[model samples]
Target chain A: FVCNTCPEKWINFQRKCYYFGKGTKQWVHARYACDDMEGQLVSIHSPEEQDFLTKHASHTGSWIGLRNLDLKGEFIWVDGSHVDYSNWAPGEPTSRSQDCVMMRGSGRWNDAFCDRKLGAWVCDRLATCTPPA
Target chain B: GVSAYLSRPSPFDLFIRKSPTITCLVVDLAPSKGTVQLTWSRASGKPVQHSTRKEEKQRNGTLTVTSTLPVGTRDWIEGETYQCRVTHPHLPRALMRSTTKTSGPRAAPEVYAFATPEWPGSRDKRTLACLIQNFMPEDISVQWLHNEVQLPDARHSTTQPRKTKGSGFFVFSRLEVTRAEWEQKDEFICRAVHEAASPSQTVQRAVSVNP
Candidate 1:
């Protein structure tokens, strides 16, 4: 069972809480934005999770937790969670120069530099909620 | 939201031969869809007489319904009272208007633009929204221009106009672009043309990068 509250403007699905940031921010700025909200860049564990975000991110792609900075070719979630799944597009993870990962509105994933100021970002964490008054 | 207003008597009515002597009241509903019900009454709790209503549905789903009642010159006398009430599931209360009442179209709309960015891949991408506010008749055309070039309708979206109480109408249109284009800054503009303006003036606001 998931928590009853998903925070204001946050979406609840399964056992997790997801937040889509409103303003555009760079990858690093997006990471801090999620942290300010008590969450971290989202980490997807299954295709269903990836698809769910893709539908919401259809207008613009959003930042996810995956990055290959610590070790080349080894992507890690920012939250230090297990790297259980991926949904990269064709010819993705194309260059070592790009360290951060973003999920397009089409559900395809691609690597990008950390400084690119994309439109939006996604955050996820264990649901922390309360019944509405 | 929806609002009802009595349009001022048209000036052409006087010049046209055999002009219909009618009092026209217009109801503006925004983001409109589904069913709508309207009722007309008098201050004496009586039904209005010699009245006819017209309904028009817009492409954005807004509904503009006009109710007309044939009236002689005496109907304009002091202390006369007629009421128009609008009912819709979306409305919190029935909207009411009186025959003795009148409302003017709001002034030229205020147009503004903002950028909402998203990370879709290796590049920067964002959706630009052009907001047009406080206009009347609920029928305004909103368009987006990229580097002074008009974008195709499929490349952008315009939301249904929303009614503002005692003001007029407001709406938004959005366009998608890459970060590379966004950096072009003032190259984008949000243009709103309203029917109320004489000669049909266009209000535009340039899209700034910071937004």
Candidate 2:
């Protein structure tokens, strides 16, 4: 099925509208930037979504919603969902200095430092299809 | 390089519970490795007096580790900073990250809805504007309503919250309608939806042709 509910400059995938912010920001700041746009950092809930984000990111690393902000060792989406599916690279998340998560150009997940700037960021929210009155 | 960050502790809203601890988490993306260590310290005081670790292994094979440091309610309330240091074999020196509990109160937004006056009795187009300002946390949405019926997103244009000179935020929205509808139809309402309100998370203001 196709949807025409997204705003200009956003990509409609499935039922959500995704915006690829080309600017760079630290993980926390990236989260705030997405919040300012009325959406949260993109949360990958399925392999389908993960695959789309990975390819959309193409050659640059981008920040996602997965982070260990509320409690250590516990990663949750900005929407407060514990991960049910993850795509970490082999031997990944085994090292530290980073609490935020980013997607490699290879589409693999890597936990990285929140302070380091990222090449791009992703934001997603439900499609703006208001039902008929 | 191993990257770790300390999540800042925050105070309770409705006296629900005391803000007790702050955490530092490390997720390494380097080559197959561990040699990952986390140390906690207060900026002025001694090293983290009470610190602990919790770890989980990935299905792909590995450990995503975390260290949480307990801070007294009063100590955090007094605004003392805490530091988390990450030590790994690949890095020359420990990577330092610090945090102090965020301090502040939330601000409620104000709503003003109005209709622009046009040539009297002229069947021209008129615009209705809604200005919502001074909110904190920047978590709010705007919508329009008429005859107690919700309007569609296509009918109005609401700009995203723009930060004010200070810490507050504001949103500007406008809708287009013919002069006939402005006078014949019921009042148009602008709703500012804030999640923190007790009486009503959604506050509204309406403008009528007579007003």
Candidate 3:
């Protein structure tokens, strides 16, 4: 049986609810969009999680939790996790102009301009348990 | 000493049939009298199950051999990697290639040029970026020209090519110039070369510099 904690049309993985958004927006706006849904942009922790997200990632592109906006070369996740995992494409984080990161359909990540409006985004949060009846 | 080179393998291609859950790997070689063997295996070197082999002649007379394997969606989701091994009687050993999960033919690029610091004032060293997007085969090239003359590499920085979500690629060629040079320049153009475009055709987009 399907879990009731996750909203309709959202996917549940490891007790986490994820929404693969259809609308496109800039990185900043995408963050707000997820926040509006009572979630946040996805933060990948392991290779398996990255693979799962990539498999469902839009061909156009998807905004993730990793960004270098605050500290240039240093990246941080919105979930406040340590920057232990990354899947940067070869020769990525190339330009100073690109402060935001995008997860490609190939599961590899690239640094892109924050203002460049691409396609799709992902929202994720922990699945809540149903209240006792 | 003349060495004969055997026909090289055509671009490796992967096809999928969602209805029946079939994945096919196809490769072509020029007509030759050599043994051609095709095998399918997981990235872990384990052979996948339910695979069939076929050979056909293309209109160009090349021999196309394909290996089809059946896989479950669960296996695919579990990150089961698949590889295609091709062996021939040529001088070299077995040549190996893996299936790119995403596959599509090359496409022409769309080129556009824009300047940084949109409205440039005096003494502003501006950056001009020529953006080429929605192309494929990653082996694309970008050329930057000022006043119809080619600029040197030292004056410009071309970002490394990035793959689009689909089977396309995008890149940016940035050129730095002074405000006076930009205002006085007659024209700036970006030339994009792609395999999909005809040889005689030059895909370029130009922006006029108006003081």
Candidate 4:
């Protein structure tokens, strides 16, 4: 059941809410879409958080908050979340036109070209879990 | 988040010619982001449908979306009042532009030609005047003729057309003529030209004078 504080269809986990999108949009537009929905592209900071997101992100090969938009090769989370854990596929983050990150169906991350117009997306936000009386 | 305007139905499209169809175009040009809206509505608070929209990518990573509303069904509304609006995600307020069909029936100008009364003893030159009123669409030409010949050398000026209360247009033109140039009953003509109809029209008003 959807928690009272989370938007319907979104999953609540430990004071955070996450949404998985099935639509195809580019990375730039994906971030904006999530922002419009009051969230950012899912930012996985820990193995547990990564595991939780991979449950669906792996199923959909969805986009994540990680991006090297500056082209300086330094990946930054759109939500400014910490990069305390990493889940890179073998030979991943290769230098190319691929600066945006996406989670593959194998539950591993890959730096994909930003203009992946046919890819899905995942969004993460505060759950708004008001302390119960 | 977004900027917009009514790209079609230009302000100069004031003359909506005789036709069975009219188009309303709304353009939403903004950053390459999501959460944008472009819509149409009438002054009567009614929904507008049967419209189509298309979007493209701008050179600067922005999007250009065009909305076409076939006003032919009801002139955008049965009463002719509608707006093309845009709502941006990061903007404080929405942007909108509305157009109204002010194209009235074709009405020719009522032309009048006269000369200023001569002053006491200082009659070196006379002012030949032409006044045109109650014209539609406001695209008319005024020329001065001397004895059936084009007075190209006449020092004359014509004012821009002015809108009238009757939803019409008015224009004023004047030329200088000297009595010593000709004999008794010499005429100066004010030729008001208008393409109010097919082959165009030349309405002439003449004033006669004796030196």
Best by lDDT: 2
Q: Which has the better TM-score: candidate 1, or candidate 2?
A: 2
Q: Output the number of the TM-score-best candidate.
A: 2
The predicted structure with the larger lDDT, 2 or 4, is: 2
Which residue pairs show collisions in model 4? none
Which one is best on DockQ? 3
Q: What is the alpha-carbon lDDT of model 3 when measured against the actual structure?
A: 0.65
lDDT string for model 2 (B59-105, tens) is 76545779978776534533456788888778778889988643334
Q: What is the C-alpha lDDT of each candidate?
A: 0.65, 0.72, 0.65, 0.65
Judged by DockQ cut-offs, the docking class of candidate 1 is incorrect
User: How far in Å is the alpha carbon of B72 misplaced in model 2?
Assistant: 17
**TM-scores for every predicted model:** 0.36, 0.40, 0.37, 0.38
Model 2 chain A: which ten-residue window has the lowest total lDDT? A67-76
lDDT, residue B22, model 4: 28
Task: List each candidate's DockQ score.
Answer: 0.00, 0.01, 0.03, 0.01
What is the DockQ of the complex in model 1?
0.00
Give a tens-digit lDDT track for model 3, residues A1-133. 3344788778887768899997757676677677778898898888888878987999988888777422124677878775777898999866533166788889889987655677789889988786666
Provide the lowest-lDDT 10-residue window in model 4 chain A.
A67-76
Place model 3 in a CAPRI quality band. incorrect
Candidate 4 total steric clashes: 0
True-structure lDDT of candidate 2: 0.72
- Say what the interface RMSD of candidate 3 is: 17.0
Q: Write the per-residue lDDT of candidate 1 for residues A1-133, one digit (tens) a residue.
A: 3374677878977778899886766666677678778898899998888878887884677888887422124688887776778788899867533157888878888987655668889999888655556
Q: Write the per-residue lDDT of candidate 3 for residues B33-90, one digit (tens) a residue.
A: 7657766666444447776767778787666666666654323322244565666665
